[PDB]
Amino acid sequence: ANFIAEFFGHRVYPEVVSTEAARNDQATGTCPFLTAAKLVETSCVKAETSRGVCVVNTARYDWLVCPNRALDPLFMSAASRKLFGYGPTEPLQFIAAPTLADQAVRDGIREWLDRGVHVVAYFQEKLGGELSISKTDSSPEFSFDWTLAEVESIYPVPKIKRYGVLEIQTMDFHGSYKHAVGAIDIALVEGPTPAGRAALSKKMEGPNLSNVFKRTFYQMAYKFALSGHQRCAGTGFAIPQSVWKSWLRHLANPTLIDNGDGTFSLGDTRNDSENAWIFVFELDPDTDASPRPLAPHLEIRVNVDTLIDLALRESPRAALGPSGPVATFTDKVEARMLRFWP
Amino acid sequence: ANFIAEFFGHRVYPEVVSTEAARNDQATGTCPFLTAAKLVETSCVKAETSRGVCVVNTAVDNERYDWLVCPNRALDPLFMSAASRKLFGYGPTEPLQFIAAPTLADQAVRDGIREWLDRGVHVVAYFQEKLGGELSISKTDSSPEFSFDWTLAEVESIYPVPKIKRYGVLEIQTMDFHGSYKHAVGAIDIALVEGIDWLPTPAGRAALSKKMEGPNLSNVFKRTFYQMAYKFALSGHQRCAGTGFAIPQSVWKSWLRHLANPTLIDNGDGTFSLGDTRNDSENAWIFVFELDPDTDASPRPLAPHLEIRVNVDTLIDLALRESPRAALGPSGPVATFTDKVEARMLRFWPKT
Numbered sequence: 001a002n003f004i005a006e007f008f009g010h011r012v013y014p015e016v017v018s019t020e021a022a023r024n025d026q027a028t029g030t031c032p033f034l035t036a037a038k039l040v041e042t043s044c045v046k047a048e049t050s051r052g053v054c055v056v057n058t059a060r061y062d063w064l065v066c067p068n069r070a071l072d073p074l075f076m077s078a079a080s081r082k083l084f085g086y087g088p089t090e091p092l093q094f095i096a097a098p099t100l101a102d103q104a105v106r107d108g109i110r111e112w113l114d115r116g117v118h119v120v121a122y123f124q125e126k127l128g129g130e131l132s133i134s135k136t137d138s139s140p141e142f143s144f145d146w147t148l149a150e151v152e153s154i155y156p157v158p159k160i161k162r163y164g165v166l167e168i169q170t171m172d173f174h175g176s177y178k179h180a181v182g183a184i185d186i187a188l189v190e191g192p193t194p195a196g197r198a199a200l201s202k203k204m205e206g207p208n209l210s211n212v213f214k215r216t217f218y219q220m221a222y223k224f225a226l227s228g229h230q231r232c233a234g235t236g237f238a239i240p241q242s243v244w245k246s247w248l249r250h251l252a253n254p255t256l257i258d259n260g261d262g263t264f265s266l267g268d269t270r271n272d273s274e275n276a277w278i279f280v281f282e283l284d285p286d287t288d289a290s291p292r293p294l295a296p297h298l299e300i301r302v303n304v305d306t307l308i309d310l311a312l313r314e315s316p317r318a319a320l321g322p323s324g325p326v327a328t329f330t331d332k333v334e335a336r337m338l339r340f341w342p
Numbered sequence: 343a344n345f346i347a348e349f350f351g352h353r354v355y356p357e358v359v360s361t362e363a364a365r366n367d368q369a370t371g372t373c374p375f376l377t378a379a380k381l382v383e384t385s386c387v388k389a390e391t392s393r394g395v396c397v398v399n400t401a402v403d404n405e406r407y408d409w410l411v412c413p414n415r416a417l418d419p420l421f422m423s424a425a426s427r428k429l430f431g432y433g434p435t436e437p438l439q440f441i442a443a444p445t446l447a448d449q450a451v452r453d454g455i456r457e458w459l460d461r462g463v464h465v466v467a468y469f470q471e472k473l474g475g476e477l478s479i480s481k482t483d484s485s486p487e488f489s490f491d492w493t494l495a496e497v498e499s500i501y502p503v504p505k506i507k508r509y510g511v512l513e514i515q516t517m518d519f520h521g522s523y524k525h526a527v528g529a530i531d532i533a534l535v536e537g538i539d540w541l542p543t544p545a546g547r548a549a550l551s552k553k554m555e556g557p558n559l560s561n562v563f564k565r566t567f568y569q570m571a572y573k574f575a576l577s578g579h580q581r582c583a584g585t586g587f588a589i590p591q592s593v594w595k596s597w598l599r600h601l602a603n604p605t606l607i608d609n610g611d612g613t614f615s616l617g618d619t620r621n622d623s624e625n626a627w628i629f630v631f632e633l634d635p636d637t638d639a640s641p642r643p644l645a646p647h648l649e650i651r652v653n654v655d656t657l658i659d660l661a662l663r664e665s666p667r668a669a670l671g672p673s674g675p676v677a678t679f680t681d682k683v684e685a686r687m688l689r690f691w692p693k694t
């Protein structure tokens with residue numbers, strides 16, 4: 001029970017990856033997803049209390065902890081193709097706000113725009129910083145974890161054709177990582193084993209599953225509403241299979257409709273004027289090469305009226321069953337009063 | 343420009359309440375609402391860092407607002423009574439007695455219950471975190487766990503066994519702060535014991551109430567909406583009599599923005615309703631109270647000046663359809679956003 005799954009982007013718990021990349025990344029202390037995004041060596045921006053523990057596995061499900069771990073080229077492209085109306089093959093390139101500074105990258109995109117390549121610049125907390133929609137007297141401010149921007153020009157001045165937003169869902173873990181991260185620290189410095197791996201696992205409590213959908217729903221329901229409209233191309237939510245299972249509860253376990261393509265959809269999409277997406281990805285796919293690529297397991301097109309109806313109409317309908325938790329709640333009360341009886 | 347508004351249930355910023363109860367409660371170090379709820383004297387359960395600071399005042403552009411921070415402050419007999427009448431469908435005059443869960447250990451209290459019940463007095467028992475502990479509805483195949491800040495239980499019997507007819511749910515919204523209040527608490531702490539004489543208002547009070555950060559306005563409605571929508575859907579059904587949310591005027595003003603500034607219907611009585619609730623199946627309520635009404639009562643009574651019967655379908659529509667429509671305005675924040683992206687890119691543009 002309870003173990004660190006990845007250490008600096010490389011597996012450790014079920015399979016212990018020790019490749020030419022995994023050797024150096026661990027020692028130098030580098031989260032590769034940021035380094036690949038930029039063009040320069042950068043560390044996992046977490047505190048030394050919970051350093052390279054970018055992914056964690058408990059009783060057997062993996063969980064996403066470092067939001068920077070979501071920066072997977074294979075996932076980015078996959079998600080962006082559905083947010084902006086792209087086909088499977090259309091040429092696609094991603095930048096990152098800070099890397100607009102060097103001439104080499106700019107020459108590349110100029111050459112790319114000329115031949116019709118979809119150039120997308122992304123903005124993220126530790127990269128180019130993240131961006132927010134303005135407050136209004138009738139609507140609130142919202143921040144995006146990822147802001148994807150269809151670049152169309154960078155020489156007269158920066159100009160963007162359209163924009164998408166992606167939201168990355170991370171998990172909390174009650175206690176601290178300091179014993180687990182502390183134990184594997186001395187092991188890594190100078191000098192797989194059942195005795196050694198047991199120490200790196202035994203230290204931390206389980207997931208903080210209390211808020212997995214409670215904190216997310218509103219901004220999701222809200223940001224999904226803005227998706228198909230007003231130079232906003234689409235809104236997506238990125239979640240691991242672990243979190244999707246939890247989500248199915250709050251959504252009264254529906255049945256996804258499997259479209260012609262490798263696509264599923266909540267409710268009827270046939271004529272949907274929004275562009276809302278939920279991407280369920282696998283943390284450990286069939287392959288085991290380099291850092292594990294975040295493959296899209298499920299690509300779900302959301303119907304906002306079904307998401308609201310399921311979450312807030314159909315779900316509490318199941319809670320109001322004639323044998324359900326609201327009918328039997330009075331019993332919990334009565335039993336608790338008994339505790340006080342002399 | 344941020345001050346401690348209430349110290350141990352007594353005002354400390356706008357006007358200095360120096361009544362007899364104000365002098366005792368603070369010096370003894372007691373949160374008086376827990377003391378009243380129990381039948382034992384009890385201190386504010388908050389840590390030595392953010393001690394008896396139960397309410398906080400901030401500037402917020404202009405006008406200046408009061409925020410609730412100690413959830414134990416909402417334990418106001420007058421409020422709880424006013425609120426519960428609406429949840430259960432009690433008339434304004436019917437006798438009503440409230441009894442905290444831990445006080446069921448006493449027999450003299452239990453003998454009181456038996457007496458009231460035989461007279462036809464409505465006996466409600468409540469379950470709050472520090473008091474009787476919180477209560478939760480259990481998660482199923484198709485629904486999640488929820489715990490209620492206040493579980494209001496309509497007692498039906500007590501002698502043979504505990505029996506309840508139906509239950510109410512009251513939820514209290516508290517405001518979070520950025521930094522610790524320890525610098526402010528510490529300064530007022532030294533002043534309280536090491537120096538007699540209330541009088542400290544200009545140099546003394548302002549400094550003691552300084553070193554304080556503003557409110558975390560980020561989670562004001564977003565963190566509460568689902569919780570609310572879901573619990574509201576349950577309100578008029580299956581032995582759940584009703585469910586209410588208690589929020590200060592300050593938070594309410596903010597809640598209107600998230601709801602696209604809707605106009606409230608005016609019922610015959612002193613209630614308001616959000617949307618048409620004439621044939622409403624649920625029993626959903628929002629209770630807005632003033633923290634500082636024009637009164638000089640030692641601890642300020644939380645008098646709900648607004649009691650709003652909610653239409654669940656209306657609540658959702660406004661929060662999840664109308665508000666995003668505002669955001670998608672002709673020149674709104676969604677249209678304008680593309681400019682923020684472009685302006686940002688310039689901050690990474692090559693120079694020299």
Ligand SMILES: [Fe+3]
Pocket residue numbers: 031044045052053054066068069
């Ligand atoms: Fe990382």
Ligand SMILES: [Fe+3]
Pocket residue numbers: 350373386387388394395396412414415
């Ligand atoms: Fe208090």
